[PDB]
């Protein structure tokens, strides 16, 4: 929650962090996208790579990204403290993000947040003591017709009841992987009472093309 750093024993510039060699090939692939002379523009993917290797960012990944891109370390500190994904504290393995903005609060995502809080025994921001589940509360995640929805580390879980998210937490505790989709009768975003549109077959190539083309 804080935007200063204090050198704890488990988080310091002497904390061990280095990329794997396949991650060095990935950082080569990232840096080769950007033009020559603007290598610094590879801060945000590579640092996110340094979050996908470790799960979180101690202050050695910030120093390592500043070391391999030859940028000042303060310019990576700004990126890690500006963006809400760079977890600068050690999160659980299933980082649960509940969206409770206005289109999801209208569709009662507060009941889902209460269900996750009583199911895991924790509250918003805390971590379960087995370090599996981190429950926080985030802003609009972009699935507003599929509201109310949560996010688990890569995945969207949409149209949720409290029973649905209890089912998802149950199949996450046993080690299984769930299906990232809407848990109601619809598939992605269509009207739940059947398709009100795009029922006709798409015509294909050549349809309606103007002359002289």
């Amino acid at each position: 929650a804080l935007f200063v750093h204090r050198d704890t024993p488990k988080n310091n510039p002497e904390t061990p962090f280095d990329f794997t060699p396949e991650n060095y090939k990935r950082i080569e692939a990232i840096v080769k996208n950007y033009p020559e002379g603007h290598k610094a523009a590879a801060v945000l993917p590579v640092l996110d790579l340094a979050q996908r290797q470790n799960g979180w960012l101690p202050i050695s990944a910030m120093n390592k990204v500043a070391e391999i891109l030859q940028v000042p370390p303060m310019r990576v500190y700004e990126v890690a403290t500006f963006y809400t994904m760079y977890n600068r504290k050690p999160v659980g393995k299933y980082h649960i993000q509940v969206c409770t903005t206005t289109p999801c609060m209208l569709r009662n995502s507060d009941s889902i947040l209460e269900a996750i809080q009583k199911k895991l025994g924790i509250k918003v921001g805390e971590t379960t003591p087995d370090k599996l589940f981190t429950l926080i509360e985030v802003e609009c995640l972009g699935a507003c017709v599929n509201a109310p929805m949560v996010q688990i580390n890569d995945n969207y879980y949409e149209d949720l009841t409290p029973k649905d998210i209890e089912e998802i937490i149950d199949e996450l505790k046993a080690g299984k992987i769930p299906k990232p989709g809407p848990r109601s009768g619809r598939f992605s975003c269509e009207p739940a009472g059947g398709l009100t549109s795009l029922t006709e077959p798409p015509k294909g190539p050549g349809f309606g093309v103007q002359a002289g083309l």
Binding site: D48, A143, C144, D154, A192, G193, P202, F207
Partner: protein, 430 residues
């Protein structure tokens, strides 16, 4: 044409919007995409700019700037710097979930849009700044871009036209302000998402200091359909200077919250009752509608009966179109809790660069958190109004404007509900 709405399935631009067909290359070429692309590329930038200008296409990002007139700023000779079409794919606007559908379900339409747009403005590559929350959609789009390179459609000698054009995907990192075009440029450059000042516009100094056009996913993806089908075809739908089709995201308190492509000047009541089945409890249960996502001011039930969902008829309703995201709020809704949560969104998602947003959006969230309880006196309504007028137009980007607008809409349309809230607080705590 006088009436609008009830759009046919054959006049849709975004077929396979619902994921029912194959999103891949064999699916996209079976739906008309990547057809006669080389003949579009060979006919020059000026022909494509004339097709987009004649079509009446406006900004689908939310401001509604004329898209052909926007892209024609880049049709200017080189100076040693390359040019870049950069696709704004962030979509952090609450209520808005349409570009997620375009990237996840129609990716090759977006890739051909990047190609035709980058030919139209002489751009060298394409940076699709996709949202960091849209990870599976980003890998989805990267598989489609792999299918576009490996078929020889883009890259070296794109579609066999002698034109070279790359397409990149840069993921975000969870920042709503990085949807604004200059802050998106600042996020691609490896910096904080702090918006630049205008001028320099991105057509002069954009990404890496190059000429740049930052354009929405929708207004990029529909442009090969405009070039194939014609300009007059896309101009025939909707009113004049409100031409075309539009994706609408009906969410909130409706029976069937859904994304649907619909004609531009459709009535709001017809849209909600047809595609969403109406408001939960009927149309008489409607209390308010935020018409186009959080940035636009809400309109009450007395305006939603006859209003049209294009730019100009909503500007006549002293709100905006924006992202065309219809948030429906019925009678069971504490509207003050919802708008104070919306201002809480605009202070948790605000980059802190300049003064009036950084201070006043937190201060409007504190005043709105007291207005939820009613822990104020009614002279703090008009006071708060002045605070909105001290933010609207005095900031760098339009997130200060997009945070001043809902406060103004809530005050203007439900001042007596706030007043009776505060007076019942004042009597029950004294």
């Amino acid at each position: 044409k006088t009436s609008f709405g009830s759009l046919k399935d054959e006049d849709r631009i975004f077929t396979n919007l619902y994921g029912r067909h194959d999103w891949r290359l064999k699916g996209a070429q079976s739906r008309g995409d990547w057809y006669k692309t080389k003949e579009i590329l060979l006919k020059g930038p000026d022909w494509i700019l004339g097709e987009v200008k004649t079509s009446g296409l406006r900004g689908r990002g939310g401001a509604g700037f004329p898209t052909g007139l926007k892209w024609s700023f880049m049709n200017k000779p080189s100076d040693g710097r390359p040019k870049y079409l950069v696709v704004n794919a962030d979509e952090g606007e609450p209520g808005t979930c349409k570009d997620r559908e375009i990237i996840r379900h129609d990716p090759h339409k977006l890739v051909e849009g990047c190609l035709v747009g980058g030919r139209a403005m002489g751009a060298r590559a394409a940076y699709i700044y996709i949202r960091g929350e849209f990870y599976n959609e980003a890998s989805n789009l990267q598989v489609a871009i792999r299918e576009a390179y490996e078929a020889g459609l883009i890259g070296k000698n794109a579609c066999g036209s002698g034109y070279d054009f790359d397409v990149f995907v840069v993921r975000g990192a969870g920042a709503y302000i990085c949807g604004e075009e200059t802050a998106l440029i600042e996020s691609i450059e490896g910096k904080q998402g702090k918006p630049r000042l205008k001028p320099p516009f991105p057509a002069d100094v954009g990404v890496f200091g190059c000429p740049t056009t930052v354009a929405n996913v929708e207004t990029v993806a529909v442009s090969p359909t405009i070039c194939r089908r014609g300009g007059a075809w896309f101009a025939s739908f909707g009113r004049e200077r409100n031409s075309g089709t539009k994706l609408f995201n009906i969410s909130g308190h409706v029976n069937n919250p859904c994304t649907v492509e619909e004609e531009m000047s459709v009535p709001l009541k017809e849209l909600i009752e047809k595609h969403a089945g109406g408001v939960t409890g009927g149309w008489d249960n409607l209390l308010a509608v935020i018409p186009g996502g959080s940035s636009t001011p809400l309109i009450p039930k007395s305006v939603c009966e006859t209003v049209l969902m294009d730019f100009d008829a909503l500007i006549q309703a002293q709100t905006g179109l924006g992202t065309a995201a219809v948030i429906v709020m019925d009678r069971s809704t504490d509207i003050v809790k919802a708008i104070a949560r919306l201002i809480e969104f605009y202070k948790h998602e605000s980059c802190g660069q300049c003064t009036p947003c950084r201070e006043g959006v937190d201060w409007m969230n504190k005043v709105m958190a007291r207005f939820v309880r009613g822990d104020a006196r009614p002279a703090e309504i008009d006071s708060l109004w002045e605070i909105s007028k001290q933010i609207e137009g005095h900031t760098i980007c339009a997130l200060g404007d997009g945070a001043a607008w809902p406060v103004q809409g809530l005050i203007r349309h439900f001042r007596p509900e706030l007043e009776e809230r505060m007076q019942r607080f004042a009597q029950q705590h004294q």
